[PDB]
Each structure stands twice: as C-alpha cells, then as structure tokens.
C-alpha cells in the first residue's frame, strides 16, 4: 500500500462484476529492493530508499548507462543487491518495518486501495500560442490578420513593462505530475503487475511511483 | 520514414531511380540521408528476387524503372532480368544485409556529407 516503483506498459479494459466497463492501466513493478534507510539522527528525517530495476555489473570500459559505475556498485553492494536504474525515497512509510535489503513485492497493495501516482508528463515541443495556454483564436475571416498570436501584453505608460507572470510561447514539455485518488483494480503476483483504474502521466515504459493516498 | 525535401511523388520517383541505378552499377555515390532511405528499398527488391515466382516478378516491375544493360560478350538484358538472374543467386543464403554504407568527407559546393552505398 505504502510505496513502489514501476514502468507503464499501456492501457486496456476490464469487466467488473455487475458487468461494467473499466478502463485500466498496466503497471509492471518487479525487482523493488530496499537500499539505504535514512533516520532523523543521521539525516534529519525518516525515509527509505528503493531501487527499481537491475542493470548489469561494472565493466572496465563501459560507455553507457547500462553498466553500473564504481560508486553505484559500492552503494548497491552495501546492501547485498545488484545495481538499479531508478532510485527514489519514500517519506510516507513507517521506517521501523523494511529491513535493509528486503524485497518490496507487488502484493503489498490490495484490490480496493486508493493511491496517488506520480510521473513525468510527456514531451510536447515548442507549441506555445493557443495550445500552451488554452487561448482563443482571432477571427479567420472578414479582414482579420490576427489568428494564433497572443493578445496584448500589458498596458500603456503606467506599466512601462510587461509583468512577471505573462503567458507567452515557450515549449509545453514534460513536468512532474501527480494524479490523486486513483484505485487498484487487481494485483497479479505471478506477472508482477498492478491494474490501476484510469490513466497516469507519461509515455509508455516510463517510471510511475505509486504511493498510498494522502487524503 | 523521412521526407527528402521533396513532395510525395517527387520522392517516390527519385527513389525508384536511385534503386535502379544501384542494381546496374553495384556501387553509387550520393548523400547520406538518401542512402539511408534507398537502403531499405533495394533490399525488398532483392527479397522479391529471391522468391522467383511470376507473382513476385510482377511486383518488382512496379519499382525498378526500365533500362538495358550491355555486358561483355554483347549481352543485353534489362534491370529486372539482371536482378532475378544473378543478384538473387548471389545472395541465396544471406538472410538480410545485402548493402553497406561508407562515409566520406563533406562535398565542396555545399556542406553535404557524401557517402558510398555498395552491394555486399
């Protein structure tokens, strides 16, 4: 229930009993292990640090992020584990559980649990105009010459300047987004997937970060 | 796939021409982005040629424009005949490949990256 990391596979649907259609997202969360554990005496705050999926071992002349480097090797070996791709901290959990080196399994969650999902939204390039800010077009007709530009930016004299929050073209892009109060539809322990009701941020095969709902 | 600074029909036209002169000469010199596109057009032709039947000989005639080759001993054959004749028997056991690209320096007039695409 508390926290887990996974990859986003895609969307499908499921028929709930009483025969209603449920749109669903498939999240695959295998190889979650507890790395270092932080405490208030050493660090000032309580949290656990989890690594998601394992990469290959250290090689002498590696040139990509596929192989671990020496500092990551040492860190992931202090707890008897293999190196991981993604690492995040969870502050909402109880730190007195979770021995270092444990495996966080997918059945820590149960069907019916309310959760929050946090991803990185997906990648829209320089789009700015009426797509970035949901603004109105000018007329397409009678004599217009004003279609997709922004309007006026400010006033005359009094403000001989623009202002600090003015909305102008400049890349939609890939912010961090949390969607609150989704729901777990079904947990699959042999395939190690969770079915979440709805849709979550990001492209396919991106990282998702499920947590128990704060509200 | 990639647009090569041309419209849909100019692109399709010069891509058949590029595929046909590679089968004639076995080796041609062009820019890099064009080579990376004709790479996959030529190998599907060679696949059609290794099948050999009449239905595929007719599918290869939709590409592969129309030229006569004059080999030694005064043999005249078309491009479609040379393909199905010797190009197919050459790579009768490859399972893909059939072409390689080799980079050269930039051209003088423009900065274009020049390339040699050959037929392995």
């Amino acid at each position: 229930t508390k926290g887990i990391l996974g990859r986003k596979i895609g969307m499908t649907q499921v028929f709930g009993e009483n025969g209603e259609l449920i749109p669903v997202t498939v999240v695959e969360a295998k190889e979650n292990v507890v790395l270092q554990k932080k405490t208030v005496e050493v660090d000032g705050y309580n949290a656990i640090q989890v690594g998601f999926e394992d990469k290959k071992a250290y090689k002498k002349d590696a040139k990509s992020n596929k192989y671990a480097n020496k500092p990551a090797e040492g860190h992931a070996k202090k707890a008897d584990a293999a190196p991981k791709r993604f690492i995040r901290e969870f502050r909402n959990v109880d730190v007195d559980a979770y021995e270092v080196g444990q495996e966080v399994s997918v059945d820590t969650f149960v069907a019916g649990d309310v959760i929050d999902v946090t991803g990185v939204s997906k990648g829209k390039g320089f789009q700015g105009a009426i797509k970035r800010h949901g603004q109105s077009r000018g007329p397409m007709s009678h004599g217009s010459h004003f279609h997709r530009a922004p309007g006026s930016v400010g006033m005359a004299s009094d403000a001989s300047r623009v202002f600090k929050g003015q909305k102008m073209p400049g890349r939609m892009g890939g912010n961090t987004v949390t969607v609150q109060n989704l729901e777990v539809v079904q947990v699959d322990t042999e395939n190690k997937v969770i079915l979440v009701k709805g849709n979550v941020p990001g492209p396919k095969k991106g990282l998702v970060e499920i947590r128990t709902s704060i509200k | 796939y990639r647009k090569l600074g041309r419209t849909s029909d100019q692109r399709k036209a010069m891509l058949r021409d590029l595929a046909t002169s590679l089968i004639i000469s076995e080796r041609i010199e062009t820019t890099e982005a064009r080579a990376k596109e004709v790479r996959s057009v030529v190998e599907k032709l060679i696949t059609l040629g290794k099948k050999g039947d009449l239905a595929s000989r007719r599918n290869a005639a939709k590409t592969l424009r129309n030229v006569e080759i004059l080999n030694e001993d005064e043999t005249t054959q078309t491009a479609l005949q040379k393909l199905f004749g010797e190009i197919a028997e050459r790579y009768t056991e490859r399972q893909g490949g059939y072409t390689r690209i080799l980079k050269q320096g930039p051209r003088r007039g423009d900065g274009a990256e020049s390339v040699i695409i050959e037929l392995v």
Partner: protein
Amino acid sequence: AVPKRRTSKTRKNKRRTHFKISVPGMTECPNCGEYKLSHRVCKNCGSY
C-alpha cells in the same frame, strides 16, 4: 525596429564570445597515409 543607440566595441565583442568553430574529430590512418576524419573512409591517401 531600428537600433536606438549604436553598439560599442566592447558590447559587440562580448556578443561574439561563442561565435567560433571547433577542431574536428581527426583519427589517424594507421596502415598508410595521414590523418582522416573519424568514422570515415579514405580509399586513396590512406590505407584506412
């Protein structure tokens, strides 16, 4: 639309801080010949 004041020597030269070109790849042709551009082939003037 038009510049209000002329641009001084110092501001013009600050703006050209990054306007430069860099040295190319330049691997050396071992078996025969002089330097060549890396990942390229020099059939003449080089064994590679």
